[PDB]
Amino acid sequence: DTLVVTANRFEQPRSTVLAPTTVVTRQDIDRWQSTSVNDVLRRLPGVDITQNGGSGQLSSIFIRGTNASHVLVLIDGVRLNLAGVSGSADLSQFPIALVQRVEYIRGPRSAVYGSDAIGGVVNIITTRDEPGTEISAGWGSNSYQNYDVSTQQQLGDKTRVTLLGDYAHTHGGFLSKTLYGALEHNFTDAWSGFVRGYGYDNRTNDTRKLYSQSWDAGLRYNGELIKSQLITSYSHSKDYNYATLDEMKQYTVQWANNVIVGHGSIGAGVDWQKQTTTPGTGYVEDGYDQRNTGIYLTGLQQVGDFTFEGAARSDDNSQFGRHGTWQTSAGWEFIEGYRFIASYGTSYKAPNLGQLYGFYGNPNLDPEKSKQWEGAFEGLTAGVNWRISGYRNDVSDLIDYDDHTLKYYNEGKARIKGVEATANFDTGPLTHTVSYDYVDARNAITDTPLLRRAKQQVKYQLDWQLYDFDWGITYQYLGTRYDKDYSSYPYQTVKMGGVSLWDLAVAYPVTSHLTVRGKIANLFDKDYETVYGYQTAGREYTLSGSYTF
Ligand SMILES: CCCCCCCCOCCOCCOCCOCCO
Ligand SMILES: CCCCCCCCOCCOCCOCCOCCO
Ligand SMILES: CCCCCCCCOCCOCCOCCOCCO
Ligand SMILES: CCCCCCCCOCCOCCOCCOCCO
Ligand SMILES: CCCCCCCCOCCOCCOCCOCCO
Ligand SMILES: CCCCCCCCOCCOCCOCCOCCO
Ligand SMILES: CCCCCCCCOCCOCCOCCOCCO
Ligand SMILES: [Mg+2]
Known about the structure:
Keywords: Calcium, Cell outer membrane, Ion transport, Membrane, Metal-binding, Porin, Receptor, Signal, TonB box, Transmembrane, Transmembrane beta strand, Transport
Membrane topology: Multi-pass membrane protein
Transmembrane segments: 133-140, 144-153, 159-170, 174-184, 189-205, 208-222, 224-241, 244-260, 263-272, 288-304, 306-316, 320-335, 338-352, 369-378, 384-393, 408-425, 429-444, 452-464, 470-485, 493-507, 520-531, 537-549
Radius of gyration: 23 Å
Binding site for Ca(2+) 2: 206
Bound molecules: (hydroxyethyloxy)tri(ethyloxy)octane, magnesium ion
Subcellular location: Cell outer membrane
């Protein structure tokens, strides 16, 4: 789709966002037959996801060679709570059934959102406008089972309700049960309100029990020139392993405005966050109270063939104090349908609980800091939409353990040089969506490649319909990756060879109300790991259906 909200919080055409952007819709997710968020993200440019096995197991997201803690994940605009204790986003627990849209914008965005937005930003949206009720379910390899009931209806004029329940289970397993309710209200044709509440109960296998609930409420104004939003959020998670218990409550309040001025816009906002942990959470002795407040400004202008886009933010954190970030981009459409874009931006990552207050803690840590430069050419040629970008990311003040003193300090440096190339085009009835990433991510002090990241990836999606059958084939090449073997000491660095992977999916409208679908994932039964030592699934079959009325 064309409109995004994730670049500056407010709706704008993608063509006007100078950073590389990707949008995934629910229609996309339904066709691909993804059974996890990771399976969605894995398909997209610059994404390198590793996982300790199959569904539900611990996983890491490396966007454009950056550390796992250097991606900002938002759910409906607000920092994912599950990232809260460890200070690093893991989506393996977040229910796929709740995903209605993903908006993913690469490059820095601390200047809008604050901490973590270094490699990029991933915004998982849970809202839909899609009247009706749906029942669906599926069955697959490894005793995979799913069923789900969902309904959105009008409760008179101005108010609409959404209700969802979902059960997902797999064995070696992982069991996830989810409930979601939302109420939306139009006071007028410009003033809106919403209240949202959801929660899930996950069990994974040593056993993990994870409870998470989130409540959001807000008010929005959508006028001809002026747009505003006041947004409230509360998330509570309890993560049991066995025993340890990690428990965090996260409080968010944000107020943002934006106005259309000429061929462009200007915006500002204030963003407050409180996180509270329980004693013994995150292997820290005491319970902690962390607070952050940020203020920022955005801008977009089009003059002639040129486009200018920018943001700047000041954050005040209860532990490290004040840190400012900014970014600026310019695009030149030098000939119709072609653009050169140049970008610069700074971003940062806040120290986490363990690093500050754990056994090896240092309460005076400063943030990790990033500087990025990016240049791109984008075009439309002979029916092909394409883009190629080169970026450099210098990361400094990395928080590292010193074995000399058994404490964490700011000191490491990394340098990432990367290339992203993308294209989409049709050939008769066939649709092609392709990307290539080169990622040269290095310790800038030793000049050694960083571990766990593939230097090269190729991803290819091929879609077409013939009789009434909707077919999709997905191809991925995962390049070579260096990792450590933790089965025994000492921990040896190993070299995992590149692998090719293929998936095949089909759908068919049995009626206008009933759609049946099947999928064979890892069609050639390739044996491979994304984390050394941890076996992935192998060839799996899934058969599913959805009935709408
Ligand atoms: C009235 C200010 C609104 C935009 C401020 C955020 C921009 C932060 O850096 C921009 C300054 O750096 C050079 C700006 O050059 C072009 C300005 O960007 C145009 C935004 O409308
Ligand atoms: C590297 C030095 C830092 C320079 C800071 C520059 C501050 C930005 O000032 C330029 C602002 O220009 C336009 C501001 O935003 C206007 C948005 O819409 C304007 C309508 O035409
Ligand atoms: C609203 C747009 C904001 C753009 C401003 C970004 C410009 C960055 O300013 C320069 C960076 O900060 C200067 C650091 O000062 C050097 C430290 O030396 C002090 C020694 O005590
Ligand atoms: C509407 C508020 C807009 C705030 C944007 C400024 C915050 C981002 O600033 C950029 C940070 O880069 C330099 C600022 O940090 C240096 C602090 O210097 C203060 C004393 O000289
Ligand atoms: C790195 C970006 C490269 C930009 C290359 C574009 C330079 C010229 O592009 C094509 C200009 O128009 C030519 C299109 O082909 C002829 C179509 O003529 C119109 C049909 O009557
Ligand atoms: C504007 C797109 C960048 C072009 C992609 C590959 C073209 C290579 O030109 C020379 C190769 O550059 C050597 C290093 O390439 C990786 C660096 O990426 C840019 C980071 O500085
Ligand atoms: C891509 C280099 C020449 C100009 C780009 C044309 C359109 C690019 O779409 C390519 C999508 O397919 C992947 C291309 O992979 C080769 C580019 O890799 C650059 C090597 O550093
Ligand atoms: Mg020494």
